[model samples]
Target: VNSFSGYLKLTDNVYIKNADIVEEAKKVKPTVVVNAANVYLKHGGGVAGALNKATNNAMQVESDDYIATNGPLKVGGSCVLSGHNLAKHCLHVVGPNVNKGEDIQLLKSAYENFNQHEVLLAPLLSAGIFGADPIHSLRVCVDTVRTNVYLAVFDKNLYDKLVSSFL
Candidate 1:
């Protein structure tokens, strides 16, 4: 664990790190970066917005085609899009919008549905625009993944809490 950087190991491979999502996304160059989005794949806010801005909304175009053929995705389901300016691939998972009283279990189910890869980077699901608690959301991410999960976080309070928990 790196106390100075607020990086901690929650398991043998899974880790939580305090860093800018974009910066860490580049450093890890993960196979995939999970984007918490709605069924329509609108990249309007939160991590989805960041990814859209970074990739020039390429994901939305792909997502549009996917939804046209597959229909709207349900909570906990996902679709993959080619990573334009990010990782090699981007996994778009439909996470519950906590503000709308969406169940946290949907968030857990979404995390659990992700395909295992050599390396993956993800934000705390539903923690931003969705208004879910960061610590609990992050705990769900850590508990659901068996691969190298990089929990990218920028909130200092959440970072401190995660680090303290592991320590």
Candidate 2:
């Protein structure tokens, strides 16, 4: 089932999803979160996986941490990653059937050269007809983005204090 919650105010302009993990990550001010898939990443983390598991069971929580796929990116018979003009990250989870391992690896490979300010560029995600499991695709996406964020912290420290006032 698809769900949406109004954006929550964090700073004057920054916002995040209220109860949704995916939305929270994407809804940051100045950034618009977009999802192309219909199947929700309802915690199963894979295709044919249970949509809703009991509380005790681990489930993949859909978060805007990564972009989802709708079909496969290709050039006449061969699958390829496409670049969209609007998305910052162009992701592709290979295979017609869902495979979390492959998806995650693909995502990681893409983010090895990620740039946060490049969020304005649209990234294409090809999917079904020759698509992999939508949920698994999302899982890899979220994980990959997280890894990029972690790496970013070290690459550049955007917040270094130059002058401080002592009382």
Candidate 3:
């Protein structure tokens, strides 16, 4: 378990225990490095496994009622969103609770930032994207966030629509 330093404290709520803040500070390098970390939990991977089950159960219930729903499955808290003035955009997807689909969403968002290969700062955690590869959540992160997206997390569903735009 390691700790990283941050500048801004975005969320104030304690229960909002999760804080995804993409720093507003960065360099204008051709390639930006982003960190996508997983929330630490004790008792091994059981906690994340349980969370995965719970979300799956809820989705099943939703599917039973709304059979018309289609496209990528959405798991709440699977993707963490934040904003920064530097780089075109910043996206932080913490592992553990995130659904792979959310990763795609995050990447799609970042690609939008690129919008024709403009210079942007985007750093992502390899661990978060590849950590839980066996899990569905990891799949989405790899598919989406690893692109040339230049959109920020706070861009308000930049990636969300990107997924639907082609579908």
Candidate 4:
């Protein structure tokens, strides 16, 4: 696995990391692993797709249950599912679409819901195919939440960019 990893502190209590989220899941065993989810609960692509696969499709079912009862979640809404592969829970947040002009506030709100947990593994919210700016997403996460946050990045070049920006 070609991966790069490091840690940077946002505050005394809040820190961020760049690494494979699932790999970090193994080491930290966080209370929750968070990823972006769509309104439909389909888990069809991006981080949500990977999470659905990792949890044995348990995450998809949980989101479906929520949708069945509450209807499609709005952007910034979230729900939790049982974590099968790593953590005890998986938190799925509805991310803004690519055309939403990088809703950093909404992305930050998504993290707010999971802030009570002691440790959380999260992706760069909306930064994948969802098309939000990764740097802005990272800053929003660091600024808005106060947990031990692990920011997962799959690409070594992306990881390097994040680290370089901090320096």
lDDT per model, in order?
0.77, 0.26, 0.29, 0.74
Q: Which digits, one per residue and each the tens of the lDDT, describe model 2 over residues 1-167?
A: 11223533223222222122232223322132222222232223321121122212322222222224433232211211222221223222223223322342343343323333223211112222224433343333344442212110010121111001101
Instruction: State every prediction's TM-score relative to the real structure.
Output: 0.87, 0.25, 0.23, 0.84
Question: Which of the two, 2 or 4, has more lDDT?
Answer: 4
- Model 3 C-alpha lDDT per residue in residues 1-167, reported as the tens digit of each score: 11223212222210001122233233232233232323321112232222223334442343334324332222212222222233222222233334433353343343233233223333232223233322233234334433332322322343333333321
Clashes of 4: 0
Cα lDDT, model 2, residue 134:
33
lDDT of 2: 0.26
Which residue pairs collide, candidate 4? none
Cα lDDT for residue 49, model 1?
A: 83
Question: Is 1 or 3 the stronger prediction by TM-score?
Answer: 1
Each prediction's total of clashing residue pairs, residues at least 3 apart in sequence or on different chains, is 0, 20, 20, 0
Q: How high a TM-score does candidate 4 get?
A: 0.84
lDDT tens digits by residue: candidate 4, 63-99: 7887888888778878777777778887877767776
Best by lDDT: 1
Local error of candidate 1 at residue 99 (angstroms)? 1.0
Candidate 2 TM-score, C-alpha based? 0.25
Worst 10 residues of 3 by lDDT: 9-18
